[PDB]
Structure formats: C-alpha cells, structure tokens
Design a protein around this ligand. Structure first.
Ligand SMILES: Cc1cc2nc(/C=C/c3ccc(O)c(Br)c3)sc2cc1N(C)CCOCCF
Ligand SMILES: Cc1cc2nc(/C=C/c3ccc(O)c(Br)c3)sc2cc1N(C)CCOCCF
Lengths: 61, 61, 61, 61, 61, 61
C-alpha cells in the first residue's frame, strides 16, 4: 500500500557495444520458423506472457 | 494506494553502439516465418502478451 | 489512488548509434512471412497484445 | 617505376559507431594546452610531419 | 621497380563500436599539456615523424 | 625489385568493441604532460619516428 522506489531499473539493457564482421550469412527456411540476430532488447509485462526470441515450428490440427 | 517513484526505468534500452560489416546476406523463405536482425527494442505491456521477435511457422486446421 | 512519478521512463530507447556496411542483401519470400532489419523501436500497450517484430507464416482453415 | 594497386587503403577509418552519455564535462586551462575528444580522424602526409592530437605546453625563450 | 598490391591496408581502423557512460569528467591544466579521449584514429606518414596523441610539457630555454 | 602482395595489412586495428562506465574521472596537471584514454589507433611511418601516446614532462635548458 506504499512503494517508495528511487533509481529503480526493471528490464533494462544499457552500455552495450557489439561488432559483427561476417563475410556471408545465409538462411534457408522451408516450412518452419527461424529467429536469428536479436540484440539489445528489453521489456516488461504485467499479467501476460513475455517472449523475446521464440520460434515455433507450426501448429497442426 | 501510494507509489512514489523517482528516476524509474521500465523496459528501457540505452547506450548502445553496434557495427555490422557483412559482404552478403541472403534469406530464402518458402512457406514459413523468418525474423532476422532485431536490435535496440524496448516495450512495456499491461494485461497483454508481450513479444519482440517471434516467428510462428503457420497455423493449420 | 496516488502516483507521484518524476523522470519516469517506460518503453524507451535512447542513445543508439549503428553502422551497417553490406555489399548485397537479398530476400526471397514465397508464400510465407519475413521481418528483417528492425532497430530503435519502443512502445507501450495497456490492455492489449504488444508485438514488435512478429512473422506469422499463415493461418489455414 | 610501376605500381599497380587495386582496392588500396592508406590512412582510413570506417565502420565506427560511438555513444557518449556524460552528465557534466568541464575543462579548465590556465596557460597550457589541452586536446580532448578526438574521434574518427584519418590523414596521409608525404614529406612532412603528421600529428593528430598534439598538445604542446608552450615554447619559452 | 614493380609493386602489385591488391586489397592492401596501411594504417587503417575499421569495425569499432565504443560506449562511454560517464557522470562527471573534469580536466584542470595549469601550465602543462593534456591529451585525453582519442579514439578511432589512423594515419600514414612518408619521410616525416608521425605522432597521434603526444603531450609535451613545455620547451624552456 | 618485385613485390606481389595480396590482402596485406600493416598497422591495422579492426573488430573492436569497448565499454567504459565511469562515475567520476578527474585529471589535475600542474606543469607536466598527461595522456589518458587512447583507443583504436593505427599508423604507419616510413623514415620517421612513430609515436602513439607519448607524454614528455618538459625540456629544460
Ligand atoms: C498502466 C499502469 C501502469 C502502472 N505503473 C505503475 C508503477 C510503477 C512504479 C510504482 C512505484 C514505484 O516505486 C516504482 Br520504482 C514504479 S502503477 C500502474 C498502473 C497502471 N494501470 C492504470 C493499470 C490499468 O490496467 C488496465 C486494465 F487493463
Ligand atoms: C608515398 C609512397 C607510397 C608508396 N606505397 C607503396 C606500396 C605499398 C605496397 C606495395 C606492394 C605491395 O605488395 C603491398 Br601489399 C603494398 S610504394 C610507395 C611509394 C611512395 N612514394 C612515391 C615515395 C615518394 O617519396 C617522397 C619523397 F619524400
């Protein structure tokens, strides 16, 4: 019934330096799911599912 | 019934420096889902699902 | 019943520097979904689903 | 007496991403020399001295 | 009397990502030389002295 | 009398990622030389002295 927060950080990404030197990147997808190259991502979810890099193949019935 | 927040950060990305030197990038998708190259992303969701880089193959019935 | 927020940040991206030197980028999609190259994105959602880079293959019935 | 150069690079800076988040920067100089904050600099000198960030105090006689 | 160079690199800086989060930077110089914060610098010198970040106090006589 | 160089690199810096989180940096110089914070520097010198980060106190006579 009383929250007192100072300099609070929830779901934060800071101070990031990345270098990527690639000569050839290739992705070949046939019918499925592919998630590649996710960087510097942050989030906060209240009463819900929280996903960042989720690959689901498929949903058959 | 009483929140007192000072300098609060929820779902934040800051201070990011990225370099990408690629000679050839190629994506070939046939019927599925592909998510590539997601950087410096932030969000906040209240009573809902929160997804950033989600690839779902398909939904068959 | 009483919120007192000072310098609050929710779903924020700041201070970002990116360089991309590519010689050839190619995407070939046949019937599916492709999401490539998402950077410096931020949002906030209240009572709803929040998606940033979501590729869904298809919805069959 | 014969040079054949292809894709030659001399004194080159490329593909650089920098971020600087400072709250207070202060310089106080009394009688001398100060060089601060030099980034992404390139040069080429033929028959001459080549200096980038040189601070000389003074020259007395 | 015959040079054949292909994809030659002399004095080159590439693919660099830097982040600097400082709260307070302060320089106080009284009579001397100060060189601070030199990044991503490249050069080439032929028949000459080559200096990047040189601080000389002073030259008395 | 015959040089044949392919993909030659002399004095090169590449693929560098640095992060510096400092709360307080302070330099106090009285009469001398100070060189601080040199990163990602490259050079090539022919018939000459090559110095990167040189601090000389002073030259008295
Ligand atoms: C959207 C929202 C956001 C939100 N953020 C808060 C405090 C963060 C904090 C509080 C205290 C602290 O000390 C610190 Br640090 C941080 S309360 C709050 C309430 C709400 N709503 C109105 C919910 C309505 O639901 C919609 C129905 F579907
Ligand atoms: C400036 C210069 C630069 C230079 N760079 C060369 C080859 C690099 C290389 C050669 C062969 C290789 O296989 C490779 Br890898 C790399 S020759 C050359 C000659 C000269 N001059 C004209 C000298 C004139 O002097 C001025 C008098 F003060």
């Amino acid at each position: 019934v009383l929250y007192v927060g100072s300099k609070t950080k929830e779901g934060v990404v800071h101070g990031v330096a990345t270098v990527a030197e690639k000569t050839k990147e290739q992705v070949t997808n046939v019918g499925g799911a592919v998630v590649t190259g996710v960087t510097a991502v942050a989030q906060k979810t209240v009463e819900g599912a929280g996903s960042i890099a989720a690959a689901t193949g498929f949903v058959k019935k």
